[PDB]
Amino acid sequence: SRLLNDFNQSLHKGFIDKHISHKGNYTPKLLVNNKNEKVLSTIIDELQKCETFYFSVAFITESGLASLKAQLLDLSNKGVKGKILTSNYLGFNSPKMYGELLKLKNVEVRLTDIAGFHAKGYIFEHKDYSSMVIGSSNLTSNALKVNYEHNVLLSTMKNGDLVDSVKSEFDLLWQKSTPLTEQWINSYKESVEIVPNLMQAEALRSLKAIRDKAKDKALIISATGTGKTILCALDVREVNPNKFLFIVHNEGILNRAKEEFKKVLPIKNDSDFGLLTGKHRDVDAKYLFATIQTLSRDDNFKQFDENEFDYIVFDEAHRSYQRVFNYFKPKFMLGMTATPERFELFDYNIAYEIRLQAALESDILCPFHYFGVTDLTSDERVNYIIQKTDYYGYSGEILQGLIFVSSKKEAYDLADKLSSKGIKSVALTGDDSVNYRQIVIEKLKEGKINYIITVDLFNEGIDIPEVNQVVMLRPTESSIIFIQQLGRGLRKSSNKEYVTVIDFIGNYKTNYLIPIALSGDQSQNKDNYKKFLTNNDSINGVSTINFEEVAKKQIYNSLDAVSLNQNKLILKAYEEVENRLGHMPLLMDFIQQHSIDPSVIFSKFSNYYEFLVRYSKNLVFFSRQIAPGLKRIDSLVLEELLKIDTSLRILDFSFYSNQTFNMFLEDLIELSKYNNEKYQKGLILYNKYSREDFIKSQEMPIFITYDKHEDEFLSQDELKWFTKSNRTLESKEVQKILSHRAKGIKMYIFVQKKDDDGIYFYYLGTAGYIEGSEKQDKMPNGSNVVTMDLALDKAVRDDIYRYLTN
Amino acid sequence: SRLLNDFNQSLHKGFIDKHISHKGNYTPKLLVNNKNEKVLSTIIDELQKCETFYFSVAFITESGLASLKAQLLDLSNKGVKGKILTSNYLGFNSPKMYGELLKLKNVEVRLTDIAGFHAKGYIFEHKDYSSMVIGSSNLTSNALKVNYEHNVLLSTMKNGDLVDSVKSEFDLLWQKSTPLTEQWINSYKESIVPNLMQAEALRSLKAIRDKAKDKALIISATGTGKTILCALDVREVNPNKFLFIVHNEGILNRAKEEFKKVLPIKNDGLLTGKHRDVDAKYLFATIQTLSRDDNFKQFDENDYIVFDEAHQRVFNYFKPKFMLGMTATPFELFDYNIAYEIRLQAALESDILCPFHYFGVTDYVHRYLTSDERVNYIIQKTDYYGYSGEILQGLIFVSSKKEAYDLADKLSSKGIKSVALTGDDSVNYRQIVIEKLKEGKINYIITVDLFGIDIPEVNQVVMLRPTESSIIFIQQLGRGLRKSSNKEYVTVIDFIGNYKTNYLIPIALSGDQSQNKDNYKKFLTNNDSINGVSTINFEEVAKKQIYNSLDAVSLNQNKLILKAYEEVENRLGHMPLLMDFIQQHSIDPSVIFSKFSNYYEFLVRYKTLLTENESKNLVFFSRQIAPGLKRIDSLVLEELLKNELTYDELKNKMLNDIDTSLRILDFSFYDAFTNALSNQTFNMFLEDLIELSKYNNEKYQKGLILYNKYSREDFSKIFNWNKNGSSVIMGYMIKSQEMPIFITYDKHKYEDEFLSQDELKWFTKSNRTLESKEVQKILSHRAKGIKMYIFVQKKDDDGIYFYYLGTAGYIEGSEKVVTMDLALDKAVRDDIYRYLTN
């Protein structure tokens, strides 16, 4: 039985001999640690491919159950049921948490009362074998994603002594635990200096450069629209101005920004911090915080001495509000805005750009759990939406959410429809008055209503920190749009630990765009976005991105049937980049401003110039030759030429208007060097190379396009290798190969996925041969092929393995 | 080679097939805190036999480190060094606990501040292989003995891949972590309900209350937990004329607060001396304030009096409804009616005591015994197993009055403020010195006599005297067992010297009165069933001293049997039958049966009826009834006495296993008895042995029980043999579908040897060879006949009573003196395993 032969090998690698290259995914007995192979990754996998599961976890947090929440639903639609066992030891679990458990209709939950229940055991029963994860990780996003937790993944066959001891232990306290219902829930409810981090200090240095270069009008854009006020205060603290004025368009944000400034700064509360709202006129204060409405009305700005504040901060929705109130002549003018769909006002100087991915690493954003779901007709949609929003739930104690719809007629209708049977449901639109917008905003903030429904008022407006839930009921028009509406929920608040965004996916042509926004991947490779899309969650902090199975296919279909090289998309990207700088930009400005990777420009046009021409050989070669770095032998030696074998190889490769041309060479070579460092440092593992970028003398390069549905992986250490058809199984075709992997030459294995293209071939490392009975022949019909099982020297990573093996 | 074949069988059994047997001890284990198995056992176990350890454990507490402390000290003297990795993830990891980590001489403690350090990784590498314990247990006493935890013990080779990951991960952040030095430590700157035992007690008082007796006493060996038991009985019936009498003054206020907690009504008395409450019908006076100048004439002679051991006597004269008392004494008064006896084991189960960590250490080698060398050794030892709180508030019991004062002077000259306090001290100097410790003005009070002292706050109990008795030991252990705010537990340090009286230490702690030296030695090796947070530890050189004291002394002499009889007779007031020994927790009646033929020959020997015929009847009656093996035999005797029914019509009636009825009858069988019944002494002694049959059986046997000491004769009797043979069975003997095997295990040439927890080597008698007359029978019988029953004794144990460990059978290929490897059907328990394999 191969099942036993596979287990023996794997059991032999995990406990006896690590150098032996096994042929079994069962029980290599791996140690799960949160070092870019997060504990959440393998527990999702074991959940996906299991018939049943029973957990014996002592501590469940709601944010952690959210990470498993979409995987358990897809399991319920598959017919997979499970059990969970917990306790009320130390009063740690909350009723709201216990309520989310009851929503798992396919998960059976009982509550034990053994003293000091601290067990943390997850057990997955497969069809043939079983897997157990035992260790220190609770069911909480800290233990699951970001922590230093020790657990061990043990796979095993159904007759193991360890399994029996565990199952018989579970069934013991399961037989004497009490089940979970709402009736049980009712009984339970009755009974210092802030220092800049990596992103800010990086942002701070850019502002300093603008200051130290003698200018006075800068700008800061935040895609989400958040994370700015604290950045400003850090920057104000360095300059230490005599007087400082902080302009804002929204009054609620104003006071919050003031309190936020107080934290960064040690000065007296009364002396320096003054509000200048409708009801406050602290004009004598050293740090003044004012709405434009009050500064503009009745020339209130006129009573202030011009150029008396050394530092000003507007947020650039307040321009052209009061255009006339730009008259101050301060030492430094700084504006901050949510990124523009379309600054000219601030003399084309961008201090720093806040991107979603960067801000998540910096822990300046509220964590979020994105959830993509299936299926503007009110009746059917409303009831489906209610039951889907109910399942995934909200992060706080009460529901405070903004719903984004496709059109205004839908927004108002949906609100009244939702209003039936308890949903609060009030709609705002571009049509509605300022007073009405403010009133209903206060209503949501005051928890008077749960849902505010809009379509357009997401830009520098309705910025509310308290929102638990962001619902998307519209085709994602743009990445920027998609982010800004995510950004509406990303402000940290007391009521919410995280923010759940529930994204309904329908037959929209633009679903490729929604995985595009979530990653900072301007380079349009459909493989990069499919790889990030599927089980590549080891990058984030505590936030998770989950897709239901059917929704995942919907995005896949949309990304496949849509061209990303469209001439309309590249034209719009050029115009965006032009606005960023007010110039005809070089390819750099597509990088520094994160718009379009120049490798995407070349896929449609052989030159940037030719694209300019719609609205040669030197350009196409010089980019292509240098656009990737490739060890920098060319980068440094051709730099010397501009003004040991690998060196030689670089010379042979280069051999084998005009002033405008020199300038244009500069952008391409500069991109070359930047591209080099960011992607190739100074032959890098788990990277992508193309045959050109790469059996010879001391070279045996294998390039596979994995198509198992043929070469197939047997474990993380072995795969089956086919030669060409009609290969001799003897003499030159095989005896050269059977010698190479045996002795002398080393193999270089490259694996593509069948959807991918030429410039993209993963590199997995080196290999050899099993040397034992890796012989074969062909089918009766065809031309003699040879199959051999090779032994990888470096085992393949989890996330790489899971994406290649579907 | 041999290692791998053993290993693969263990991998196979753990991970592939639970039903095969295996050689070696490498099967993965599920560590849970069971009331039969605990994680600490296995952690200690892996510690003892390893070369080097390194723990990657997030949370460590003082109370857990004390358990590893004694073991880690032994490891230190063997040249074994370890590593410990810890982090202050949740911010508290108390600074003192970090001082205790510094004490660990053979442990490199490092400190990482990586985010959320939550791992619990215990790795033990022996020279041949490695062990890994991974799960949810922290280095805390609750994670290692109480809480329901989940750990997996994994044995592995040095080249296993799983250990590569764990070792390489540990090395990564060991280099990134900062070493635990004292400078860094100092640098740190940051900012009503009745127990289940009660039910037993107030049941006894209620039973006494049903009768006309108005006097009863409860015995507390430690002398604690007395307050909340009385007040619970005072609440049952409220005499509304209540008066509380004690000899200690600091206890008066404590006892008054406790009684005020159980009773909910208002406050409105105590007259501690120049005090003036004297009313409200709730008194809390002392004997001295009453005894001085006759102050009992203030109230009528005529309802809930309760006293003390040392509590003038003319003030005991006046009559009330329900007088009582509470003592810790080795009463004669109170109509000789003892209500309940609080013993150590029971009292620790109801959590009325305080947790304790005993530490048996070796006294210094080479005043008479208060030199510079013995002083500096006691210092470096009490420092090691340090105190459980934050300030040291301990007691020290030495052996002579002269030692107490001289040691106090020498101890205090080293910076450890100590004061002696012997019986020839004044009463006011005691109260000045006692309240000097309660206020933390000093750290120690050395004594010989006063075990006066009644301070709850005591951290340490140091013992520098031979254990005089079993009673004295527990009493001066009870000076810490009271609960207090300053302390989490009581560390107790007993200095084991050359004294011959060390054998009493396991006798006092276990509570096992059946003085069998195997039962005690078992309590030395592994007490994995001692529920609660508390632990008992012996240094290796100290544990052998207790073993020597057990071997070198006998527990049988006729003077001790007589002493116990006089002790029971003084607790009873009458002459004790055999049920009075057990009911008072005196020596098990088997201890009387070992030297004297029966209880009648004992009573006459130390000051009869139908002597010769009655004596033989009593000796057999002991055999049949006293062990309590096989209830039906005892019940059949009762039916014959009363039912007197018609042959096997009665015998059948019993069924509402008939072979078992028949051998009960055989045992009794194989006219004069009515004449023996006509005697009143014989009928009286019968009514005692029969009840002794019932009690022994019900408990020990009615609850062939596994992992029990069983006798050749006892097995033959249990299994309805005609023979009831004892001499007939040897190492191997086989009946019809039986073949029990009895082995005296003593590994250290070719002998019976345990190969794993389910597979040993059997050896036949006297080089009988090959496929002989009996071997082939044994092989065919295992294959097609007897279920092989097996019993294991230790080399030291003498009784024919061997531990039963299930059934076994000849492994097929094992047939290679006849030597064969057999497979047990139930793997032998860990405590039994450790004790049987020494």
Author numbering:
A (entry chain B): 2 to 192, 219 to 347, 352 to 373, 380 to 412, 429 to 668, 680 to 707, 731 to 743, 774 to 799, ...
B (entry chain A): 2 to 192, 221 to 297, 301 to 334, 337 to 345, 353 to 371, 380 to 415, 427 to 511, 514 to 669, ...
Paper excerpt:
Acquisition of foreign DNA by Staphylococcus aureus, including vancomycin resistance genes, is thwarted by the ATP-dependent endonuclease SauUSI. SauUSI is made of a single polypeptide chain containing three domains - a nuclease domain belonging to the phospholipase D (PLD) family, an ATPase domain belonging to the Superfamily 2 (SF2) of helicase, and a target recognition domain (TRD). The Type IV REase SauUSI cleaves DNA only in the presence of the target sequence 5′-S5mCNGS-3′, where S = G or C and 5mC can be 5-methylcytosine or 5-hydroxymethylcytosine. We show that target recognition activates ATP hydrolysis by the helicase-like ATPase domain, which powers active directional movement (translocation) of SauUSI along the DNA.
To ascertain the architecture of SauUSI, we crystallized the apo-enzyme and determined the structure using X-ray crystallography at a resolution of 3.1 Å. The structure revealed that the single polypeptide protein SauUSI is a dimer and is made of four domains—the N-terminal nuclease domain, followed by a Superfamily 2 (SF2) helicase-like ATPase domain, and an α-helical coupler domain that connects the ATPase to the target recognition domain (TRD). The structure also revealed that the interaction of the nuclease domains of the respective monomers stabilized the dimeric assembly. In the dimeric assembly of SauUSI, the nuclease catalytic site appeared pre-formed by the ‘HxK’ motifs from the two protomers. Three sulfate ions, which possibly mimic the phosphate backbone of a substrate DNA, highlighted the path that the DNA would take on binding to the nuclease domain. The structure of the TRD revealed that it has the fold of an SRA (SET and RING associated) domain, a fold that specializes in recognition of 5-methylcytosine in DNA. The SF2 helicase-like ATPase domain features two RecA-like sub-domains, i.e. 1A and 2A (residues 221–400 and 401–617) and the ATP binding pocket is located in a cleft between them, which in the crystal structure of the apo-enzyme was occupied by a sulfate ion. In the apo-structure of SauUSI, the two ATPases from each monomer are spatially separate and do not interact with each other. We modelled a DNA into the target recognition domain and the SF2 helicase-like ATPase by structurally aligning two close homologs (TRD of SuvH6 and the SF2 helicase-like ATPase of LlaBIII) and noticed that the orientation of the TRD and the SF2 helicase-like ATPase was such that its DNA binding surface faced away from the expected path of the nuclease-bound DNA (as predicted by the position of sulfates). Hence, the apo-structure of SauUSI may be that of an inactive state.
